[PDB]
Amino acid sequence: APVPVTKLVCDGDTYKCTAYLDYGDGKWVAQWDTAVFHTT
Amino acid sequence: APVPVTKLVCDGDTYKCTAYLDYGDGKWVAQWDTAVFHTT
Amino acid sequence: APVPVTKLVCDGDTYKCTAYLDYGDGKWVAQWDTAVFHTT
Ligand SMILES: CC(=O)N[C@@H]1[C@@H](O)[C@H](O[C@@H]2O[C@H](CO)[C@@H](O)[C@H](O)[C@H]2NC(C)=O)[C@@H](CO[C@@H]2O[C@@H](C)[C@@H](O)[C@@H](O)[C@@H]2O)O[C@H]1O
Numbered sequence: 401a402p403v404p405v406t407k408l409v410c411d412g413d414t415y416k417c418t419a420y421l422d423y424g425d426g427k428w429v430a431q432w433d434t435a436v437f438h439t440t
Numbered sequence: 441a442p443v444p445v446t447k448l449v450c451d452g453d454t455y456k457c458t459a460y461l462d463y464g465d466g467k468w469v470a471q472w473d474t475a476v477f478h479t480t
Numbered sequence: 481a482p483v484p485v486t487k488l489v490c491d492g493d494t495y496k497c498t499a500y501l502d503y504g505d506g507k508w509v510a511q512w513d514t515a516v517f518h519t520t
């Protein structure tokens with residue numbers, strides 16, 4: 401079932417975003433692969 | 441065109457995040473595949 | 481290093497979600513492919 405995200409962080413060394421979830425014992429995360437780049 | 445996300449939720453049964461969007465009639469969502477796991 | 485997401489926007493022409501990152505000059509983003517659709 402859907403649960404809120406407590407915070408989003410991204411890492412430009414590992415190219416992953418991590419969502420810390422409000423669920424259960426508090427130690428669950430969602431993680432996915434991302435492009436990370438500088439824009440103009 | 442990029443539109444704000446009003447709400448982000450993640451679901452460890454379907455392994456999807458859903459972003460609720462601020463656009464038009466208010467019923468648009470984004471959805472992507474994610475890993476969901478416990479940490480120590 | 482993990483850095484916080486300032487804000488999240490999604491685009492239903494490019495089918496990309498963009499996370500604006502709190503880092504350096506403020507022009508860094510994380511981007512990933514997404515479904516975008518209308519709900520009922
Ligand atoms: C002078 C300096 O340190 N400039 C920074 C860049 O090094 C850095 O780019 C990353 O550099 C590492 C080290 O070689 C590479 O392995 C990465 O692939 C580079 N990442 C990208 C996306 O180009 C950039 C970006 O910083 C990275 O991403 C940020 C969002 C943040 O997570 C940082 O912690 C991370 O190092 O920053 C320049 O200022």
Ligand SMILES: CC(=O)N[C@@H]1[C@@H](O)[C@H](O[C@@H]2O[C@H](CO)[C@@H](O)[C@H](O)[C@H]2NC(C)=O)[C@@H](CO[C@@H]2O[C@@H](C)[C@@H](O)[C@@H](O)[C@@H]2O)O[C@H]1O
Nearest residue numbers: 401402403421423424428450451452453454475476477478
């Ligand atoms: C006893 C109990 O209900 N324990 C929970 C686990 O079942 C659950 O892990 C999921 O279990 C389902 C069905 O048993 C598996 O098909 C899934 O693959 C499991 N998901 C994961 C990520 O391992 C966990 C996690 O709960 C899930 O993810 C949460 C973030 C939330 O979205 C839940 O609604 C979702 O069911 O929780 C245990 O406590």
Ligand SMILES: CC(=O)N[C@@H]1[C@@H](O)[C@H](O[C@@H]2O[C@H](CO)[C@@H](O)[C@H](O)[C@H]2NC(C)=O)[C@@H](CO[C@@H]2O[C@@H](C)[C@@H](O)[C@@H](O)[C@@H]2O)O[C@H]1O
Nearest residue numbers: 441442443461463464468469490491492493515516517518
């Ligand atoms: C009359 C009108 O302009 N209606 C809008 C639709 O055009 C639009 O659906 C997109 O339509 C383009 C071509 O017009 C297609 O190539 C895309 O595949 C369609 N996208 C989707 C997801 O169906 C919709 C949705 O608008 C898009 O996504 C939004 C969330 C936002 O990012 C918009 O800037 C973007 O155009 O909106 C109708 O009103």
